[PDB]
Design a protein around this ligand. Sequence first.
Ligand code: HEC
Ligand code: HEC
Ligand code: NI
Ligand code: NI
Lengths: 106, 106
Amino acid sequence: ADLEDNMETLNDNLKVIEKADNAAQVKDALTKMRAAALDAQKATPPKLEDKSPDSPEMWHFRHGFDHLVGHIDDALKLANEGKVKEAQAAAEQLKCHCNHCHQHYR
Amino acid sequence: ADLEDNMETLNDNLKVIEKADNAAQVKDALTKMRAAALDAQKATPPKLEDKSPDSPEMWHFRHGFDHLVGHIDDALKLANEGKVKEAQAAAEQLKCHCNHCHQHYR
Ligand code: HEC
Ligand code: HEC
Ligand code: NI
Ligand code: NI
């Protein structure tokens, strides 16, 4: 899968969490988002095609996925503790990670 | 100034930027936010006072301020180009930084 695929996965599953018909859908969507984020971390975005992999730009791009995965993991822990409403609330705050990275590089 | 006063400065000047309609107003407000963020950047909040300075929690807290300052700087550059509405949109996206740090550390 490529970066566009990964972003579709992130977009669809963030919306699944927002609209989940049952609690179990939340964990399943978070799990798919985590994998999409780690896959996306291994891509080069079109607007950074000219930059070194050691550029401050590519460093900040990769770091955004590490930080997103950390907060996905926090939400997964809540869902695995049965606190699925709290997990859904945490997932809502993941949109800030999307908006931040996009502001830089989308 | 102390942490409470720096946080009030950040709070109020976000609204100043929202209320504004010209570049000078937005620039002045962002410059005050930058100074408040930098004033609060280096201290340890009394909740992490027993944590090591290189501990993961202090590292993430310090990065919160470093990253906030970076995006204030970017918003300032837009204001200095006369791009009032782009600077206002960038300032509104700063709320993600405020909420991220608060949810971790407050
Ligand atoms: C950087 C660390 C990112 C994070 C975190 C998220 N996204 Fe992203 N996204 C990023 C880039 C560089 C791009 C441009 C990709 C391109 O090839 O042009 C995108 C794009 C999207 C898109 C549009 C995809 C397309 O087919 O053009 C969507 C729908 C999208 N991103 C969604 C999305 C969501 C919901 C995120 C949070 C959960 C998210 N992204 C994080 C970089 C980064
Ligand atoms: C960490 C890296 C933070 C960032 C980024 C922002 N804030 Fe914050 N804020 C932080 C702490 C640790 C505290 C509590 C300090 C204490 O001793 O209690 C706060 C508090 C506030 C407050 C309330 C002030 C009070 O006396 O309770 C406000 C109104 C506030 N913060 C606003 C704010 C805004 C608007 C921010 C982004 C622009 C922001 N903070 C960032 C830690 C951190
Ligand atoms: Ni975090
Ligand atoms: Ni950034």
